Tab-separated table of C-alpha atoms in Angstrom:
chain	number	residue	atom	x	y	z
A	1	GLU	CA	-50.278	-13.084	27.789
A	2	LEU	CA	-46.843	-14.288	28.901
A	3	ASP	CA	-44.347	-15.490	26.298
A	4	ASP	CA	-40.799	-16.399	27.327
A	5	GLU	CA	-38.085	-18.586	25.842
A	6	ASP	CA	-36.108	-19.719	28.908
A	7	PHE	CA	-34.434	-16.309	29.375
A	8	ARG	CA	-37.103	-13.609	29.593
A	9	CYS	CA	-40.768	-12.649	29.974
A	10	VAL	CA	-43.232	-10.067	28.621
A	11	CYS	CA	-46.600	-10.261	30.386
A	12	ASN	CA	-48.119	-8.172	27.594
A	13	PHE	CA	-51.448	-7.065	28.999
A	14	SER	CA	-54.286	-4.789	27.981
A	15	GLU	CA	-57.576	-6.417	29.094
A	16	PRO	CA	-59.969	-4.298	31.271
A	17	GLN	CA	-59.241	-6.550	34.243
A	18	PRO	CA	-55.676	-7.969	34.088
A	19	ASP	CA	-55.370	-11.369	35.703
A	20	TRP	CA	-51.771	-10.663	36.926
A	21	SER	CA	-51.732	-14.040	38.689
A	22	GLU	CA	-50.201	-15.710	35.547
A	23	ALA	CA	-47.103	-13.492	36.175
A	24	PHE	CA	-45.572	-16.227	38.387
A	25	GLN	CA	-44.683	-18.172	35.275
A	26	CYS	CA	-41.694	-15.906	34.570
A	27	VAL	CA	-40.406	-15.764	38.148
A	28	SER	CA	-36.685	-16.255	38.894
A	29	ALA	CA	-35.864	-15.364	35.297
A	30	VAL	CA	-33.055	-12.860	34.743
A	31	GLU	CA	-34.833	-10.542	32.296
A	32	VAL	CA	-38.486	-9.674	32.807
A	33	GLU	CA	-40.812	-7.067	31.640
A	34	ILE	CA	-44.401	-6.194	32.658
A	35	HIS	CA	-46.412	-4.280	29.910
A	36	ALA	CA	-49.975	-3.110	30.735
A	37	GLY	CA	-51.205	-1.056	27.782
A	38	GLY	CA	-52.669	2.200	29.101
A	39	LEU	CA	-53.594	0.781	32.503
A	40	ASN	CA	-55.031	2.383	35.638
A	41	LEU	CA	-53.576	0.634	38.706
A	42	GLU	CA	-55.567	2.784	41.112
A	43	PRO	CA	-58.156	0.250	42.083
A	44	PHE	CA	-55.485	-2.451	42.367
A	45	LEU	CA	-54.478	-1.762	45.963
A	46	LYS	CA	-53.495	-5.117	47.432
A	47	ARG	CA	-51.301	-6.650	48.582
A	48	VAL	CA	-48.401	-4.317	49.349
A	49	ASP	CA	-49.622	-2.293	52.359
A	50	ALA	CA	-48.171	-4.525	55.047
A	51	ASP	CA	-45.172	-4.911	52.856
A	52	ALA	CA	-41.676	-5.446	54.317
A	53	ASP	CA	-40.670	-8.636	56.176
A	54	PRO	CA	-43.398	-11.051	57.347
A	55	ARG	CA	-43.104	-14.835	57.609
A	56	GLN	CA	-44.644	-15.210	54.144
A	57	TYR	CA	-43.560	-12.385	51.827
A	58	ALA	CA	-39.901	-12.018	52.787
A	59	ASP	CA	-37.648	-15.051	52.419
A	60	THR	CA	-39.288	-16.030	49.131
A	61	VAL	CA	-36.988	-13.434	47.597
A	62	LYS	CA	-33.905	-14.119	49.727
A	63	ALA	CA	-32.433	-15.262	46.406
A	64	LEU	CA	-34.477	-14.952	43.216
A	65	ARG	CA	-32.217	-14.571	40.145
A	66	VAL	CA	-34.139	-11.694	38.638
A	67	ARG	CA	-31.433	-9.214	37.707
A	68	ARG	CA	-33.178	-7.175	35.074
A	69	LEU	CA	-36.654	-5.703	35.507
A	70	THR	CA	-38.751	-3.658	33.095
A	71	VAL	CA	-42.213	-2.204	33.870
A	72	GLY	CA	-43.435	-0.299	30.853
A	73	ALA	CA	-47.076	0.795	30.459
A	74	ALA	CA	-48.991	0.930	33.751
A	75	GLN	CA	-49.872	3.901	35.950
A	76	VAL	CA	-48.662	3.421	39.504
A	77	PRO	CA	-49.517	5.456	42.598
A	78	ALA	CA	-46.378	6.259	44.580
A	79	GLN	CA	-47.855	4.620	47.666
A	80	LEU	CA	-47.179	1.191	46.133
A	81	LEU	CA	-44.419	1.573	43.548
A	82	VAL	CA	-42.106	2.317	46.453
A	83	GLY	CA	-43.532	-0.871	47.931
A	84	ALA	CA	-42.385	-2.854	44.894
A	85	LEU	CA	-38.980	-1.222	45.271
A	86	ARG	CA	-38.785	-2.124	48.988
A	87	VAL	CA	-39.653	-5.849	48.702
A	88	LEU	CA	-37.069	-6.256	45.945
A	89	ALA	CA	-34.399	-4.674	48.131
A	90	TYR	CA	-34.306	-8.143	49.697
A	91	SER	CA	-34.044	-9.795	46.281
A	92	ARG	CA	-31.186	-9.862	43.806
A	93	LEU	CA	-32.098	-7.184	41.282
A	94	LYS	CA	-29.745	-4.757	39.518
A	95	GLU	CA	-31.334	-2.978	36.585
A	96	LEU	CA	-34.721	-1.368	36.967
A	97	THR	CA	-36.614	0.266	34.089
A	98	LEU	CA	-39.809	2.337	34.133
A	99	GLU	CA	-41.203	3.295	30.738
A	100	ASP	CA	-44.264	5.347	29.811
A	101	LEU	CA	-45.883	5.564	33.251
A	102	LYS	CA	-47.523	8.259	35.374
A	103	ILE	CA	-46.829	8.221	39.109
A	104	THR	CA	-49.607	9.707	41.236
A	105	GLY	CA	-50.196	10.263	44.926
A	106	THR	CA	-47.263	11.407	47.002
A	107	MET	CA	-44.177	9.529	48.094
A	108	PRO	CA	-43.900	8.523	51.790
A	109	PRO	CA	-40.925	9.122	54.136
A	110	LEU	CA	-38.867	6.123	55.241
A	111	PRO	CA	-38.776	4.771	58.868
A	112	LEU	CA	-35.543	2.824	59.633
A	113	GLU	CA	-32.289	3.048	57.648
A	114	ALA	CA	-31.505	2.412	53.942
A	115	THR	CA	-34.106	-0.263	53.168
A	116	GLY	CA	-33.331	0.514	49.566
A	117	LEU	CA	-31.846	-1.540	46.791
A	118	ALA	CA	-28.542	-1.778	45.019
A	119	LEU	CA	-29.869	-0.658	41.697
A	120	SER	CA	-27.295	-0.802	38.991
A	121	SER	CA	-28.507	0.805	35.793
A	122	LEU	CA	-31.803	2.530	36.540
A	123	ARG	CA	-33.368	3.923	33.367
A	124	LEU	CA	-36.364	6.193	32.767
A	125	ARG	CA	-38.446	7.048	29.707
A	126	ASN	CA	-41.568	9.269	29.504
A	127	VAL	CA	-42.148	8.723	33.235
A	128	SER	CA	-44.086	11.540	34.876
A	129	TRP	CA	-44.309	12.115	38.638
A	130	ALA	CA	-46.088	14.192	41.279
A	131	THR	CA	-43.838	16.866	42.793
A	132	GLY	CA	-42.249	17.194	39.369
A	133	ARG	CA	-39.466	19.620	40.253
A	134	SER	CA	-38.280	17.039	42.761
A	135	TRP	CA	-38.626	13.391	41.788
A	136	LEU	CA	-35.017	12.034	41.731
A	137	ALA	CA	-34.186	13.381	45.180
A	138	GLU	CA	-37.282	11.810	46.667
A	139	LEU	CA	-36.725	8.560	44.760
A	140	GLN	CA	-33.102	8.430	45.977
A	141	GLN	CA	-34.359	7.797	49.500
A	142	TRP	CA	-35.151	4.233	48.450
A	143	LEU	CA	-32.068	3.555	46.343
A	144	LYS	CA	-28.884	2.224	47.805
A	145	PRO	CA	-25.974	4.636	47.238
A	146	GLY	CA	-24.363	2.222	44.785
A	147	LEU	CA	-25.590	3.400	41.396
A	148	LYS	CA	-23.560	2.963	38.234
A	149	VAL	CA	-25.740	4.040	35.308
A	150	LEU	CA	-28.433	6.771	34.800
A	151	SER	CA	-30.446	7.107	31.746
A	152	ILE	CA	-33.250	9.703	31.836
A	153	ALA	CA	-35.347	10.191	28.727
A	154	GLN	CA	-38.454	12.368	28.170
A	155	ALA	CA	-40.327	14.542	30.730
A	156	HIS	CA	-42.691	17.522	31.135
A	157	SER	CA	-40.834	20.051	33.263
A	158	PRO	CA	-37.322	18.560	32.794
A	159	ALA	CA	-35.755	20.249	35.812
A	160	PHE	CA	-35.093	18.738	39.195
A	161	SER	CA	-34.013	20.216	42.441
A	162	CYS	CA	-30.289	19.449	42.365
A	163	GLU	CA	-29.964	20.703	45.967
A	164	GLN	CA	-31.412	17.923	48.218
A	165	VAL	CA	-30.050	15.319	45.838
A	166	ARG	CA	-27.542	13.243	47.854
A	167	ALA	CA	-24.094	11.824	46.886
A	168	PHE	CA	-24.274	9.738	43.681
A	169	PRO	CA	-20.905	8.283	44.744
A	170	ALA	CA	-20.233	6.194	41.670
A	171	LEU	CA	-22.694	7.197	38.930
A	172	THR	CA	-20.236	6.147	36.182
A	173	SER	CA	-22.345	6.793	33.107
A	174	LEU	CA	-25.180	9.228	32.592
A	175	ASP	CA	-27.669	9.280	29.774
A	176	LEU	CA	-29.862	12.353	29.260
A	177	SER	CA	-30.738	11.444	25.674
A	178	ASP	CA	-34.056	12.108	23.945
A	179	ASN	CA	-35.018	15.400	25.569
A	180	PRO	CA	-35.391	17.736	22.542
A	181	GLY	CA	-35.538	20.811	24.779
A	182	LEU	CA	-32.705	20.500	27.259
A	183	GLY	CA	-30.125	22.807	25.656
A	184	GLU	CA	-26.704	24.007	26.905
A	185	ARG	CA	-28.399	26.081	29.622
A	186	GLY	CA	-30.756	23.305	30.616
A	187	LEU	CA	-27.657	21.115	30.763
A	188	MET	CA	-25.790	23.169	33.391
A	189	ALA	CA	-28.960	23.089	35.477
A	190	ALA	CA	-29.161	19.342	34.907
A	191	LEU	CA	-25.921	17.865	36.254
A	192	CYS	CA	-25.810	19.551	39.678
A	193	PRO	CA	-22.376	20.697	40.754
A	194	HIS	CA	-20.291	18.795	43.330
A	195	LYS	CA	-22.830	16.079	42.639
A	196	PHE	CA	-22.175	13.391	39.977
A	197	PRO	CA	-18.525	13.693	40.998
A	198	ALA	CA	-17.339	10.687	38.986
A	199	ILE	CA	-18.687	10.516	35.426
A	200	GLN	CA	-16.981	8.419	32.728
A	201	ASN	CA	-19.121	7.668	29.665
A	202	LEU	CA	-21.642	10.432	29.242
A	203	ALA	CA	-24.489	10.407	26.717
A	204	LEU	CA	-26.036	13.735	25.686
A	205	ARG	CA	-27.707	12.817	22.411
A	206	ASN	CA	-30.843	14.446	21.016
A	207	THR	CA	-31.017	17.262	23.569
A	208	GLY	CA	-31.327	19.956	20.919
A	209	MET	CA	-28.009	21.745	21.278
A	210	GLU	CA	-25.683	23.466	18.851
A	211	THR	CA	-21.971	24.070	19.081
A	212	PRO	CA	-19.508	21.930	21.111
A	213	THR	CA	-17.801	25.027	22.570
A	214	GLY	CA	-20.831	25.713	24.769
A	215	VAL	CA	-20.676	22.159	26.046
A	216	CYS	CA	-16.951	22.564	26.704
A	217	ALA	CA	-17.576	25.666	28.804
A	218	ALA	CA	-20.700	24.243	30.435
A	219	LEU	CA	-19.021	21.093	31.772
A	220	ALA	CA	-16.151	23.199	33.096
A	221	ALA	CA	-18.640	25.678	34.557
A	222	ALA	CA	-20.541	22.790	36.173
A	223	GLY	CA	-17.996	20.461	37.771
A	224	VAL	CA	-17.442	17.226	35.863
A	225	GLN	CA	-14.667	15.557	33.879
A	226	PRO	CA	-16.131	13.083	31.326
A	227	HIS	CA	-14.453	10.273	29.387
A	228	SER	CA	-16.617	9.319	26.412
A	229	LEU	CA	-19.190	11.818	25.270
A	230	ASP	CA	-22.081	11.177	22.778
A	231	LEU	CA	-23.860	13.991	20.833
A	232	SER	CA	-25.113	11.812	17.968
A	233	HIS	CA	-28.371	13.683	17.182
A	234	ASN	CA	-28.214	17.481	17.352
A	235	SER	CA	-28.414	20.405	14.901
A	236	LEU	CA	-24.732	21.271	15.008
A	237	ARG	CA	-23.132	24.416	13.648
A	238	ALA	CA	-19.675	25.912	13.125
A	239	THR	CA	-18.685	29.374	14.421
A	240	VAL	CA	-16.629	31.226	17.030
A	241	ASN	CA	-19.875	32.613	18.489
A	242	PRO	CA	-19.216	33.898	22.060
A	243	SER	CA	-17.136	32.717	23.518
A	244	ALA	CA	-13.872	30.767	23.344
A	245	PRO	CA	-10.705	32.534	24.483
A	246	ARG	CA	-9.365	29.001	24.761
A	247	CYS	CA	-12.176	26.455	25.212
A	248	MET	CA	-11.106	24.635	28.372
A	249	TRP	CA	-11.672	21.181	26.902
A	250	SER	CA	-11.601	18.505	29.537
A	251	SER	CA	-8.064	17.297	28.767
A	252	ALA	CA	-8.633	13.626	29.549
A	253	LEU	CA	-11.806	13.740	27.445
A	254	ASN	CA	-11.807	10.830	25.000
A	255	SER	CA	-14.232	9.096	22.582
A	256	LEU	CA	-16.556	11.648	20.851
A	257	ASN	CA	-19.584	10.755	18.650
A	258	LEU	CA	-20.996	13.181	16.122
A	259	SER	CA	-22.853	10.726	13.858
A	260	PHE	CA	-26.253	11.573	12.311
A	261	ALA	CA	-26.571	15.347	12.347
A	262	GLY	CA	-26.961	18.525	10.307
A	263	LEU	CA	-23.189	18.815	10.316
A	264	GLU	CA	-22.162	21.104	7.615
A	265	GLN	CA	-18.333	21.760	8.098
A	266	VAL	CA	-16.302	20.572	11.084
A	267	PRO	CA	-16.624	23.173	13.908
A	268	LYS	CA	-14.095	24.674	16.344
A	269	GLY	CA	-13.082	23.704	19.900
A	270	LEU	CA	-11.967	20.186	19.070
A	271	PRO	CA	-9.220	18.965	21.426
A	272	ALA	CA	-6.253	17.288	19.717
A	273	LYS	CA	-6.451	14.213	21.944
A	274	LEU	CA	-9.012	11.418	21.976
A	275	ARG	CA	-9.107	7.649	21.607
A	276	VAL	CA	-11.965	6.974	19.159
A	277	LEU	CA	-14.022	9.405	16.996
A	278	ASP	CA	-17.181	8.244	15.235
A	279	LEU	CA	-18.676	10.505	12.607
A	280	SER	CA	-20.642	8.535	10.011
A	281	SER	CA	-23.766	9.658	8.122
A	282	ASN	CA	-22.899	13.326	7.764
A	283	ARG	CA	-22.953	16.003	5.078
A	284	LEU	CA	-19.282	16.927	4.815
A	285	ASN	CA	-16.766	18.345	2.356
A	286	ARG	CA	-13.510	16.491	1.675
A	287	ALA	CA	-10.507	18.022	3.434
A	288	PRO	CA	-8.967	16.950	6.798
A	289	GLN	CA	-7.121	20.223	7.462
A	290	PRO	CA	-5.686	21.003	10.923
A	291	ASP	CA	-7.825	24.135	10.577
A	292	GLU	CA	-10.803	21.774	10.702
A	293	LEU	CA	-9.437	18.673	12.449
A	294	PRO	CA	-7.700	17.669	15.713
A	295	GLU	CA	-5.307	14.712	15.597
A	296	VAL	CA	-7.560	11.646	15.458
A	297	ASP	CA	-6.567	8.123	16.512
A	298	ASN	CA	-8.997	5.982	14.469
A	299	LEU	CA	-12.049	7.343	12.627
A	300	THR	CA	-14.896	5.077	11.563
A	301	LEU	CA	-16.608	6.646	8.566
A	302	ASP	CA	-19.224	4.705	6.601
A	303	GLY	CA	-21.849	7.317	5.714
A	304	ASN	CA	-20.836	10.820	4.615
A	305	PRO	CA	-20.904	12.321	1.118
A	306	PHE	CA	-17.519	10.826	0.351
A	307	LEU	CA	-18.975	7.395	-0.135
A	308	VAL	CA	-21.539	8.937	-2.489
A	309	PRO	CA	-20.971	8.080	-6.222
A	310	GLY	CA	-23.484	5.675	-7.758
């Protein structure tokens, strides 16, 4: 129905003919989600097809403290989803989240200038599109340049056309977690070069990769200098497998996470400088030799087979 305790919403639906009208209960709330449970929004056409600024559907959102939006079950044609994006451009919204959708149709070109919105931390999970090879680039046309955080999880044909993608001036973080099929090569063809110029925190979790050395080379090969870096869910190994004449580790690279993995012994290509190094829940063997350890700063360790006896 619509349960909220003075700080959220849900609008958990499922019925064969959703009476969305109750939605207005959780208006002007900061956090808000709109479930739908395997819905087909293809007969739902109205209203948004005379969408922008009238004398009725425009100033109602001149200031509507809804900063965090989630829309996680429906199936939206692109002809309208963009509509929802456009109206909100007026409003005060920052984080947008699509989850388990399926965009159909084909996305329309934009008339005037940047009618888009100042999205802050746009996230994506299991969302499928139309012109699959190019969905971000097309979607960018309705986002304001100011973007801080990108999380992209799940897909079908992971790739995107990193060639008409524009700017990303300040994409601070970047999360490509939960894509068990990205890989070190898929990675280089993920973060387009001379694009994503400024990347601080950087999550690359369960993307099904192996050794760090490849990642060291791949980021240098690409064109990024990360700060934090998360790998907390891969099948990691330990070798000198080609190549590493001197793995050009990104100097100012900092906080590294290697928790929860098939980590056998500590690998190679570990820069001697960090800030924080997490590593719990591993399958390790005693020694902290310089042959198997860079100078830490502070290592949180709560799992591991060191805290084993019992």
